[PDB]
C-alpha cells in the first residue's frame, strides 16, 4: 500500500485527472463493415456521425459517452508502426 507506487486496483478507482501520471483515454480505431468490406478511420468518443466508405450509411453515432456501433462491425486500436 504505497502512494508513490500505486496498484492496478487503485488506478481503477481514481479520476483521470488525479492520477500519478497523466494518460488520456482516447484512441483511434478502424471499423469494418459487414456487407461490403470497407475500413474507416474513427475515434473513441466521436462527436459526429461517421459513414461507411462504400455503401454510405450509419456506422457510429454521437452519445454522451463512448461511441455506439450500429450493427455487427468489428474494430481494433491502431498505434505507431515505425
Amino acid at each position: 500500500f504505497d502512494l508513490a507506487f500505486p496498484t492496478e486496483e487503485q488506478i481503477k478507482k481514481t479520476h483521470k485527472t488525479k492520477n500519478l501520471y497523466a494518460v488520456p483515454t482516447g484512441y483511434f480505431m478502424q471499423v469494418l463493415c459487414d456487407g461490403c468490406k470497407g475500413v474507416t478511420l474513427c475515434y473513441s468518443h466521436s462527436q459526429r456521425d461517421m459513414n461507411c466508405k462504400g455503401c454510405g450509411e450509419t456506422i457510429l453515432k454521437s452519445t454522451g459517452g463512448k461511441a455506439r456501433l450500429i450493427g455487427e462491425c468489428a474494430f481494433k486500436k491502431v498505434d505507431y508502426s515505425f
Binding site: 504505497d2 502512494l3 508513490a4 488525479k18 500519478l20 501520471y21 497523466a22
Partner: protein, 127 residues
C-alpha cells in the same frame, strides 16, 4: 506565499495523527529548498517530486520527529542587529530550533546568517 503555507498546514495535520506518508498536488522551487534544509539537520526521511506538464506533485515520508512547522507572511526585511529579537519570540529554548532566511547566498540557517554577517528577508521556522 500561498504554496509554502499550504505545505506547512498539511504536515501539522499529518504528523499529529501519526501518518507515514503524504502526497501534495503542487511543487515549487521555494518548497524544494525548504525540504533540503529539513533533510540536512535530520528531521524527516527522503522525499520525491514528479513533473507531469502541470502543477507537479510532492511525496514525502515522515518518521515522527516534528513538533510544529510554520511560515511567516509578509516577508519582513530584517537587519543584522534584530536577529536576536526574532529568535526569542518564535523559539522555545536556546539549545535548539531553526530559522530559514532568504539571503542572497541562499536559504540558510540563522547560525550561518550571524556567522557570515548577512541580514535578509525572513521565511519561516521549524523544530
Amino acid at each position: 506565499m500561498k504554496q509554502l503555507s499550504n505545505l506547512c498546514k498539511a504536515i501539522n495535520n499529518a504528523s499529529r495523527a501519526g501518518k507515514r506518508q503524504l502526497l501534495l498536488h503542487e511543487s515549487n522551487s521555494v518548497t524544494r529548498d525548504f525540504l533540503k534544509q529539513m533533510l540536512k539537520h535530520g528531521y524527516i526521511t527522503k522525499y520525491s517530486y514528479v513533473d507531469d506538464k502541470r502543477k507537479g506533485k510532492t511525496i514525502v515520508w515522515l518518521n515522527g520527529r516534528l513538533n510544529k512547522c510554520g511560515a511567516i507572511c509578509p516577508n519582513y526585511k530584517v537587519s543584522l542587529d534584530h536577529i536576536e529579537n526574532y529568535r526569542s519570540r518564535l523559539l522555545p529554548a536556546r539549545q535548539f530550533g531553526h530559522l530559514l532566511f532568504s539571503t542572497e547566498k541562499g536559504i540558510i540557517d540563522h547560525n550561518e546568517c550571524i556567522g557570515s554577517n548577512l541580514g535578509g528577508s525572513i521565511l519561516g521556522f521549524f523544530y
